């Protein structure tokens, strides 16, 4: 009931799927990437008691309904889950027919192709959108950065990569992921608080804890003197209302959760901090890109929204970088949407509709088409 | 009576008997200072705050007064000894010890 169409700017933020339209300004879709299973079935008159309306209601059904990401590790283990996830989107919150609105498709690297293959065709059949398109979440924050040169540090919804760039020019060779997810930090948090006097395992228990991180948990630039600070610093020593109604007390954790992203010893991970992943990347970069980086040290990823994020970023680079060069990490507050924003852009980039995944193109070349000279 | 730090009331120098349920009290016009119960130096008292080591602790708007109080039920010579309410505002601190001698 309008003009040609608006591309669908649909963005499965590694934790939440989100979305607006091309040229949109706010992803009108935002909500958990989980599926939920009650256990008991009190015989209950009548119905309306969905097994799997997780979408954005099921956390209302938290507890009895369990949790399921399909793309659990940024890895869609299952898809009909995610399928009806979409339908939920496009029919309750998108409440919109795919068939007539294009869409670009958010994706991080490292995917085996058939993931997209399948998602693609099924999105044409179940969806018959006018045409789709896919785009690396990473790249989509990249333009989303608009500093076409420099790396970006995508530690976002639950994701992590380094994205060296250079007026649009990025080196995949130097490009990397950090398996870390804010979910991961979640984990160690459960570890600590529970062992520290708490019994905190349950799905929405994880819900509360993630809330805890994203509201209060932080990091201090330093650690060891900042450890002594912790040794008696009462200010931190703050209890926060457990959403039961308890007031979950908090101290050194608030920060000792995230910081391990620089020291997976705490996660015990063999990996290395996100800073020196930046630095070894940059060293991989050409000789004097490095100053480009310095100006373009774009962080990305809201869960990383914590305090001092750059504070460290810079301090350690410093600790590693030649003071000769001047560093500057780059992280907008709005890093969640940034990826959505740049995707809006690109898809909304009217000089670019040639790229979208047409039903036909796929039809002649099936899904495999997607791969070469297209994604 | 005794000198006052904050201690508009002071947790007393308890020369109690066995069984004397004794209330060491800093009822003091009150950030409100945190209290630090101590017998010993490495040694807390909260790990010993029990039905025999009990507290009522509450502020007053009318008088700007807060009650730290310690009722001691089933007074025992094992807990005959020194005890402390080290209290600190957001800015100050107050250190002066007081006595529990559970006599008999």
């Amino acid at each position: 009931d309008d003009e040609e169409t608006t591309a669908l700017v649909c963005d499965n933020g590694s934790g939440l799927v989100k979305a607006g339209f091309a040229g949109d300004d706010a992803p009108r879709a935002v909500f958990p990437s989980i599926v939920g299973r009650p256990r008991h079935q009190g015989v209950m008159v009548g119905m309306g008691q969905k097994d799997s309306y997780v979408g954005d209601e099921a956390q209302s059904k938290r507890g009895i309904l369990t949790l399921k990401y399909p793309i659990e590790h940024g890895i869609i283990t299952n898809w009909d889950d995610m399928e009806k996830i979409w339908h939920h989107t496009f029919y309750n919150e998108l409440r919109v027919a795919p068939e007539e609105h294009p869409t670009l498709l958010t994706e991080a690297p490292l995917n085996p192709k058939a993931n997209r293959e399948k998602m693609t065709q099924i999105m044409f059949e179940t969806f018959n959108v006018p045409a789709m398109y896919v785009a690396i979440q990473a790249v989509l924050s990249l333009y989303a950065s608009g500093r076409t040169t420099g790396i970006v540090l995508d530690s976002g919804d639950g994701v992590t990569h380094n994205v060296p760039i250079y007026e649009g020019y990025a080196l995949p060779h130097a490009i990397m992921r950090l398996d870390l997810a804010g979910r991961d930090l979640t984990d160690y948090l459960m570890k600590i608080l529970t062992e520290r006097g708490y019994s905190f395992v349950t799905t929405a228990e994880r819900e509360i804890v993630r809330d805890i991180k994203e509201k209060l948990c932080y990091v201090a630039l330093d650690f060891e003197n900042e450890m002594a600070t912790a040794a008696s610093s009462s200010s931190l020593e703050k209890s926060y209302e457990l959403p039961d109604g308890q007031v979950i007390t908090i101290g050194n954790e608030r920060f000792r959760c995230p910081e391990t992203l620089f020291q997976p010893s705490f996660i015990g991970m063999e990996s290395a901090g996100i800073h020196e992943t930046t630095y070894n990347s940059i060293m991989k970069c050409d000789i004097d890109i490095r100053k480009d980086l310095y100006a373009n040290n774009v962080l990305s990823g809201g869960t990383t929204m914590y305090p001092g994020i750059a504070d460290r970023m810079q301090k350690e680079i410093t600790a590693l970088a030649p003071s000769t060069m001047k560093i500057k990490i780059i992280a907008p507050p709005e890093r969640k949407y940034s990826v959505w924003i740049g995707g809006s852009i690109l898809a909304s980039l009217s000089t670019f509709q040639q790229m979208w995944i047409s039903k036909q193109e796929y039809d002649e070349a099936g899904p495999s088409i997607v791969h070469r000279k297209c994604f | 009576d005794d000198p006052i730090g904050l201690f508009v009331m002071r947790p007393q120098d308890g020369e109690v008997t066995v069984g004397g349920s004794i209330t060491f009290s800093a009822r003091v016009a009150g950030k409100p200072p945190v209290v630090k119960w101590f017998k010993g130096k490495w040694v807390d008292l909260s790990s010993k705050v029990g039905q025999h080591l009990q507290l009522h602790d509450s502020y007053d708007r009318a008088s700007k007064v807060y009650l730290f109080e310690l009722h001691i039920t089933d007074a025992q010579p094992a807990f005959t000894g020194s005890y402390r309410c080290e209290v600190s505002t957001k800015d100050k601190f107050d250190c002066s010890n007081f006595n529990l001698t559970v006599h008999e």
Binding site: V45, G46, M47, G48 | -
Partner: protein, 39 residues
């Protein structure tokens, strides 16, 4: 209330949601009167 009209126009079974939303723990009763009507 409108619970009357909204339950009569409620989705057929989800009178559940509407009754218990508008305080009607007696959707039980809402239907039982509707049943003394429709018995």
């Amino acid at each position: 209330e409108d619970v009357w009209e909204i339950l009569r126009q409620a989705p057929p079974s989800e009178y559940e949601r509407i009754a218990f939303q508008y305080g009607v723990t007696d959707l039980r009763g809402m239907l039982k009167r509707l049943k003394g009507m429709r018995r």
